[PDB]
Every structure is written in structure tokens, then in C-alpha cells.
């Protein structure tokens, strides 16, 4: 309930120090997997999705950590359909880490676009 | 060229300016053509030749797969009727066939002086050369898949003609 | 009188009018020369944006009667860009007359496609619709299909304003 959420939040403040913004420490998917999977557990996947999206607009242990997590949550939104389907649109316009402008390269980048575009055509 | 463009990175600033003037029109005329402003003309590299200017010129040629044409400016100075006209002409004709191409002019003061003191000894051969380059430029023939890059240490023995836009318009400095 | 009393702002006005008189009397030659003098005079002095563009309107008008639809195009282009930046602060007669002429020059030049582009554009046509604008569209189109019936139809409905 709160305690596990706190360990995500306090460990986020550890991770913000962690990240790489100059030549300091180091850019890890290990920390971000602890935050995003156990916050999905505390809450639900939709709730995770909105809070996470705001967090991504600041640091993120180099943005590939964030891009990987965004694909998992997205699959759950699609699975349920209705308003969560709408929520996929919202999220992708807000931040660019799966329509990424820091680098143009990735398979995850393309995949996440193809699913949004297919639902819009249909 | 005999040296790579990505491998000489850390010379980054110069690399990027050179890509954007050269690579993009050569691969894609279509974009410059749609806007209705011509593709770039002539580029100058100025500042030290000994910092690895020379490396950059070879390196740009390597990525385009352009034909690299290295010219000794003095060698363009034959003392016979028209041999000197003939070389400029050959160099250009071959550039068009073998386009894309870099035409690299090593220390431009001898084919593009200013005059010694306003006087003449041999500084009319320099003028004979120089009018031919200005003529090709001004001409009906247009630079866009043949690119000419001038190099000299100092810009203080380039002719005023060249320093005027439309015979050089892009001037890259080594920072 | 004017050129030795320093009534130099007046000089532009009279030169333009002197042209209009010449043009009607059938001295197409006299009009161009007079106009070139109004042009020398205009650039002697500071003056409004609108004046400058107005001589250029006459320049493009002589360039349809003395041929070179291309050169007519190019001034009318200059007048119209400037009126775009003035926006809706251009006076009514000026904006309307350049636009009537612009559409016409293209039809004679055989750039039929470009009358349809003016029509779609609204920074280069404004909000304006009138019979004139409808006639130019109708003739340029009557022109493309190779259709005489369509030409006669515009000629007649549109006639009072157009002709």
C-alpha cells in the first residue's frame, strides 16, 4: 500500500541523482524496472501510465529505460480498449520517448506508432 | 578519399557544416529545386591547413563517393598559348561526367591573387586564370553536382571577386 | 512650372495623370516615357507606400497594351505583396483593380492554372468576390475546356462591371 509506493518514490529521488546528466554516475534500466513494475502492482496500469508520463518529462536514466516501460503499459491499455484507448493518444503527444526526438532509432519506436496509427485508420 | 569522415570526429563542428553544404544537394537535388532557390555554389575553408583541414576535404569525398580532384594551383601555370585555358576546361568537363565531385583548390593566391602591389611581373598569368573560374560561375553552367572548395591559410590574398557572394557564398571557418 | 518651384511631391501626381491622358489619345509610346519620369521623381523624395505601388499599377497596365505579360505580372506581384502586409488597410479601389488585372494577365499569358491558384488563395485575393472575379474564373475556365458557349455566357452576365 504506502510503503512499497514510498520505496518507488524515495528510490526515484535516488535514481534522479543516479541518472547521467553530465559525467557523473550511470544510466540504468535496473532502477526503472523496480519503479514501474512495483508501482503497477501498488496501483493499476492506467494510473501508472498518467503519473509516469509527467515523470518522464524530467530525467529518466537515459530515455531508452523509459521507452521500454512505455511499451508494456501500452499493451495493457489496448487490451482493455474504451477510454484507455484514448489515453494512448494523450500519452504519445505529451512526451516523445516512443516517437523520440533525442534519437530516431529504435524498433520499439516504430511499433508503438504502428499500433496507434492502425486503431486511428480503423 | 583515403581517410574517413566519422573517424575524424572531434573535428565535429567543421564536419557538420561541410555535410550540410555538400551532401544534401548531391544526394537530393529535388529539395533545392522545389523551393526555387539554387543549390550551393562554392565553399571556402579558411584558417590553418595544418590543423587537419586537408583530412576534412578527403573525408567529405569518401562518404558521397564523389570523385576527389586535387589541384596544384601553380600547375594550372603553364607558359604556353592556351595550355592554361585547356586545364580549367578539362577539369570542369570531367567534373560533369564524373559528378558528384569535389574540386579542391590548394592555396588560392596563385590563381586568385589581388596583384602583387598593383604591378605585374607574372601576376597577369594569375589574372588569366582567375577570369576563367569567374566565367564558368557566371555562365549558363551552374554548380550543384560539381562542387568547388577553395582553401587558403589567410583570406588576405583572396581576390575581392571571390569574397563577393556568387563566386563563394559559403565561408566555413576552422574554429 | 513644377520643376523650378520645388513642387516635387506634386510632380508624381501630374506625371501619372499625364500618362492616362496620353493612353486614351492613342499614344502608347508617350505614356511610357512620362511614367519613367514619375518614377525618377518618386525616388527623388520620401513618399507613402501606396503612391509607389500605384505607379507600378500603371506600369503593369501599359505592359498589357504594349505587350510583355510577364513584365505586367511582375509589378502587379509587387503591388499585391505589399497590400498583403498592409492587410485590410489598403483602400478599396486600389486593391480590387490590381486583383482584376492580375487574374487577366495570366489568362492572356496561358498560365490558366495559376488563375485557379489565386482563387483558392485568400492572402492574394482577400475576401473579395464580385462579378469581375467571377468573370475571370469563368473565362479562364471557358478557355481550358476549349468552350465558346461558356465564354459568351460570362461576357453577358458579368458585362456591366467587367466590360
Amino acid at each position: 500500500a504506502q510503503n512499497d509506493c514510498n520505496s518507488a518514490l524515495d528510490q526515484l529521488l535516488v535514481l534522479e541523482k543516479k541518472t547521467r546528466q553530465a559525467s557523473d554516475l550511470a544510466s540504468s534500466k535496473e532502477v526503472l524496472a523496480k519503479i514501474v513494475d512495483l508501482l503497477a502492482s501498488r496501483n493499476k496500469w492506467d494510473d501508472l501510465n498518467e503519473q509516469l508520463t509527467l515523470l518522464s518529462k524530467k530525467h529518466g536514466q537515459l530515455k531508452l529505460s523509459i521507452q521500454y516501460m512505455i511499451q508494456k503499459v501500452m499493451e495493457y491499455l489496448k487490451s482493455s480498449k474504451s477510454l484507455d484507448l484514448n489515453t494512448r493518444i494523450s500519452v504519445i503527444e505529451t512526451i516523445r520517448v516512443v516517437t523520440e526526438n533525442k534519437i530516431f532509432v529504435e524498433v520499439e519506436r516504430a511499433r508503438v506508432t504502428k499500433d496507434l496509427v492502425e486503431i486511428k485508420k480503423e | 578519399g583515403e581517410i574517413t569522415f566519422d573517424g575524424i570526429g572531434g573535428l565535429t563542428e567543421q564536419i557538420r557544416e561541410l555535410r550540410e553544404v555538400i551532401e544534401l544537394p548531391l544526394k537530393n537535388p529535388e529539395i533545392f529545386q522545389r523551393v526555387g532557390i539554387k543549390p550551393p555554389k562554392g565553399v571556402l575553408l579558411y584558417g590553418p591547413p595544418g590543423t587537419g583541414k586537408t583530412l576534412l576535404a578527403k573525408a567529405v569525398a569518401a562518404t558521397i563517393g564523389a570523385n576527389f580532384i586535387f589541384s596544384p594551383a601553380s600547375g594550372i601555370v603553364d607558359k604556353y598559348i592556351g595550355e592554361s585555358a585547356r586545364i580549367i576546361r578539362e577539369m570542369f568537363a570531367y567534373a560533369k561526367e564524373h559528378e558528384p565531385c569535389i574540386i579542391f583548390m590548394d592555396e588560392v593566391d596563385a590563381i586568385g591573387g589581388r596583384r602583387f602591389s598593383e604591378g605585374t611581373s607574372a601576376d597577369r598569368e594569375i589574372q588569366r586564370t582567375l577570369m576563367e573560374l569567374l566565367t564558368q560561375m557566371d555562365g549558363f553552367d551552374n554548380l550543384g553536382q560539381t562542387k568547388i572548395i577553395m582553401a587558403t591559410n589567410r583570406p588576405d590574398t583572396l581576390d575581392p571577386a571571390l569574397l563577393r557572394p556568387g563566386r563563394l557564398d559559403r565561408k566555413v571557418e576552422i574554429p | 512650372e513644377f520643376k523650378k518651384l520645388d513642387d516635387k511631391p506634386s510632380l508624381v501626381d501630374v506625371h501619372l495623370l499625364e500618362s492616362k491622358v496620353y493612353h486614351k489619345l492613342r499614344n502608347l509610346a508617350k505614356s511610357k516615357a512620362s511614367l519613367t519620369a514619375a518614377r525618377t521623381a518618386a525616388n527623388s523624395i520620401y513618399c507613402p507606400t501606396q503612391t509607389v505601388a500605384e505607379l507600378d499599377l500603371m506600369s503593369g497596365i501599359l505592359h498589357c497594351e504594349d505587350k510583355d505579360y510577364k513584365t505586367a505580372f511582375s509589378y502587379f506581384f509587387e503591388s499585391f505583396e505589399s497590400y498583403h502586409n498592409l492587410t485590410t488597410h489598403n483602400s478599396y479601389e486600389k486593391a480590387c483593380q490590381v486583383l482584376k488585372y492580375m487574374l487577366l494577365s495570366k489568362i492572356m499569358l496561358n498560365l490558366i492554372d495559376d488563375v485557379k491558384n489565386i482563387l483558392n488563395a485568400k492572402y492574394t485575393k482577400e475576401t473579395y468576390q464580385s462579378r469581375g472575379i467571377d468573370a475571370m474564373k469563368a473565362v479562364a475556365e471557358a478557355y481550358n475546356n476549349r468552350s465558346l458557349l461558356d465564354f459568351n455566357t460570362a461576357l453577358k452576365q458579368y458585362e456591366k462591371e467587367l466590360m
Binding site: - | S74, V77, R114, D123 | -
Partner: protein, 145 residues
């Protein structure tokens, strides 16, 4: 390398010593001979020098003067002094061309350092700038012996 600094100590004599020790062919190439008033021919001469030097390797190309592969100024009289910019440039372009392999050496000698195009900033050109000082008591005494 480029040497400047006073001879009258056996600068020439040292150059030949190095030549003997390494087992280089000593080639005295006089900078005024290139500097030709005729077209290019001088450019070709610079290339021929490298060509023979590369065949004969080890080799020191010992350049009498520096006043005619240099002294080009930065003014608009650098126009006149073309022949000298071109002989030099080529010899450098050619050395860095082959910098990894040590076959040919270039040495220039003068009393004192002159205006030149940048070339002291690069390994494959004449990297090294060597000074001659004056003797001291130990040195005079050996020279006397």
C-alpha cells in the same frame, strides 16, 4: 624537423653526422633551384625528390635555405610568392601521406625562423622545432680537443 638557430658551430656538420649514423642518403636540395620562373616544373621537382628519397630510404633531405620554400608573407604580395607556397605545400602533403612509415626525413636549416604557413602543429609535417644554443665550458673544451 625544422631547425633554426645559429650555425657557426657545425650545424651542417651535425646534419651530415646524423646522415652517417642512420645510414641515410644525404641529398642537398637547394630551395632556389625550384623556385623556377617557369610553370609547375618546380612542383614536379618536389615530387621527384620524394620519389628517389623513398627508393633510397633511409634518406635526409637537407634543404639549403628556407627562403624559397617560405617567405611568402601574409600580405597581398603572397600573390607573387606562389612558387614558393606550392613547392613547400606539396612536400608536406606528401610527408603526411606517408607519416606512419619513416623512410625519408626532411630537415630545413637557417640562421633564424622566417614567416611560414602553419606546419609546426603537426606530427606528419615538420613537427619538431629544434633550437641551437651557444656552447659552454665543457662544450668548448671538447671542440678544442
Amino acid at each position: 624537423a625544422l631547425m633554426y638557430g645559429p650555425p657557426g658551430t657545425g650545424k651542417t656538420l651535425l646534419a651530415r653526422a646524423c646522415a652517417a649514423q642512420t645510414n641515410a642518403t644525404f641529398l642537398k636540395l637547394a630551395a632556389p633551384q625550384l623556385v623556377q620562373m617557369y610553370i609547375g616544373e618546380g612542383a614536379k621537382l618536389v615530387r621527384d625528390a620524394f620519389a628517389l628519397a623513398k627508393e633510397k630510404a633511409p634518406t635526409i633531405i637537407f634543404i639549403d635555405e628556407l627562403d624559397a620554400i617560405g617567405t611568402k608573407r601574409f600580405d597581398s604580395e603572397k600573390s607573387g610568392d606562389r612558387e614558393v607556397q606550392r613547392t613547400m605545400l606539396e612536400l608536406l602533403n606528401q610527408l603526411d601521406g606517408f607519416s606512419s612509415d619513416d623512410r625519408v626525413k626532411v630537415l630545413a636549416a637557417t640562421n633564424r625562423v622566417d614567416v611560414l604557413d602553419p606546419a609546426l602543429l603537426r606530427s606528419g609535417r615538420l613537427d619538431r622545432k629544434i633550437e641551437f644554443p651557444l656552447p659552454s665550458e665543457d662544450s668548448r673544451a671538447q671542440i678544442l680537443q
